[PDB]
Amino acid sequence: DRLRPPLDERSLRDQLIGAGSGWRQLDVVAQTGSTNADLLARAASGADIDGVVLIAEHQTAGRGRHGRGWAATARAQIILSVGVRVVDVPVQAWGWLSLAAGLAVLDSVAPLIAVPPAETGLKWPNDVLARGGKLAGILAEVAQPFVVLGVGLNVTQAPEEVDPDATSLLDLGVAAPDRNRIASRLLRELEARIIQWRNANPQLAADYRARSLTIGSRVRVELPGGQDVVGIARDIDDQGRLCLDVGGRTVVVSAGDVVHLR
Ligand SMILES: Nc1ncnc2c1ncn2[C@@H]1O[C@H](Cn2cc(CCCCC[C@@H]3SC[C@@H]4NC(=O)N[C@@H]43)nn2)[C@@H](O)[C@H]1O
């Protein structure tokens, strides 16, 4: 469209690689299958990917969690993956890492949209929402010693292109979205949260809770088989899992698409 310039690999490099960030390497590609895929294939080849950033202008076979698939239109989103060395950390709290990316995405964009912050938060465990619409999705995938973190931020996507519940920074009150300034600020907020995660900083758990749309509301979790538990989400436990109050007693749950029911 008219509002979708391409990126600048050079600018990003100079702002981030060694200078204003801890990231070691940065590549923009015009088209791949899945940025997660590429960084996994690359680690399985023997390459160290701790610190590597991969950004794509367009992505064709997008990966969602639990099987499903993410959809993209050329230059309309910010689509990236990054590599982190994890084996220095308990194998609990690895799920707390995909959570952490959620916060890095709500932080980077919160100072840009002019919607009441109280109507923006994080849906557990891998969605980001602004007035009911899906703003970005996150996927963490494992390949020890590394984790690969994928973000898909709808910058200028329109909903009638990838999903009817999507919205975007454009549709939220942003006339010119600067994908270079947004990508650069999000890579910084990522780096900040990952270090919190590695040093078991408890500010990570508290801030997630503060900005959760899931916590504090009746929710519904749909499980394979036609199963459905319904409860109020009281807290996240230390593995990154969802504590529910059901008839007074805690049911912990690992994943599932959660449905907010106010
Ligand atoms: N553009 C869009 N905007 C709004 N909503 C959308 C949409 N495209 C699909 N959906 C709806 O998402 C549902 C399927 N889903 C979404 C997620 C969340 C995590 C997404 C991971 C993507 C990143 S991108 C960089 C990296 N590289 C990858 O390969 N994967 C990662 N997990 N599963 C399905 O129901 C659809 O309705």
Side-chain angles (χ1 to χ4, degrees), residues 34-36 59 62-64 68-71 77 79-81 126 134 137-139 150-152 154 157 162-163 166:
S34 161
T35 50
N36 278 318
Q59 158 155 330
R63 271 179 190 171
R68 293 175 76 103
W70 186 254
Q77 307 164 22
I79 313 159
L80 58 87
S81 298
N126 44 28
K134 317 192 284 194
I138 313 297
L139 182 73
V151 161
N154 279 343
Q157 284 270 129
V162 285
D163 182 288

Side-chain angles (χ1 to χ4, degrees), residues 109-126 128-213:
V109 313
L112 302 183
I113 57 174
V115 53
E119 320 201 16
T120 67
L122 301 171
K123 192 193 288 184
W124 181 87
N126 44 28
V128 178
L129 317 181
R131 248 195 291 263
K134 317 192 284 194
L135 197 47
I138 313 297
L139 182 73
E141 306 188 82
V142 164
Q144 295 168 86
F146 308 137
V147 162
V148 169
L149 273 161
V151 161
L153 174 57
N154 279 343
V155 172
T156 60
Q157 284 270 129
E160 71 271 6
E161 286 173 350
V162 285
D163 182 288
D165 262 325
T167 54
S168 67
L169 282 71
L170 177 85
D171 299 285
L172 294 183
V174 167
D178 193 5
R179 272 200 318 157
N180 265 323
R181 274 180 285 183
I182 290 166
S184 72
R185 171 168 173 66
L186 197 144
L187 283 149
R188 266 181 283 117
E189 283 272 345
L190 269 159
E191 183 200 3
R193 297 296 176 178
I194 288 145
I195 287 170
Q196 294 196 32
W197 176 86
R198 259 200 266 100
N199 285 112
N201 202 303
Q203 197 64 61
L204 175 66
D207 295 331
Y208 185 80
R209 293 191 258 252
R211 285 168 141 198
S212 182
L213 285 182

Side-chain angles (χ1 to χ4, degrees), residues 30-44:
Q31 174 157 317
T32 174
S34 161
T35 50
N36 278 318
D38 294 15
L39 284 194
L40 290 163
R42 215 200 276 191

